[PDB]
Amino acid sequence: SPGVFFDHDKGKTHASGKLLFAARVIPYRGSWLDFEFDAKDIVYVRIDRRRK
């Protein structure tokens, strides 16, 4: 369904054991947006999972 999503990572793709909390808003028709974090504790706008 269209709307913002916050998929907290379950440890996978983490530095050691930390979570990611990828805040992604899925539009009904358009380009996806990802506001996930990293091990450096920084929010990166991974638009449509292309770049970070």
Binding residues for DNA, rule: CB under 7 A, are 12, 24, 31-32, 48-50
How is 14-42 classified by DSSP, letter by letter?
Answer: -SSS----EEEEE-SSS--EE----TTS-
Residues 9/20, Cβ–Cβ less than 8 Å: yes
Rounded to the nearest whole angstrom, what is the least distance from the CB of residue 33 to DNA in the complex?
9
Rounded to the nearest whole angstrom, what is the least distance from the CB of residue 24 to DNA in the complex?
6
The residue (of 24 and 44) whose beta carbon lies closer to DNA is: 24
Rounded to the nearest whole angstrom, what is the least distance from the CB of residue 2 to DNA in the complex?
11
Coil/strand/helix, residue 9: coil
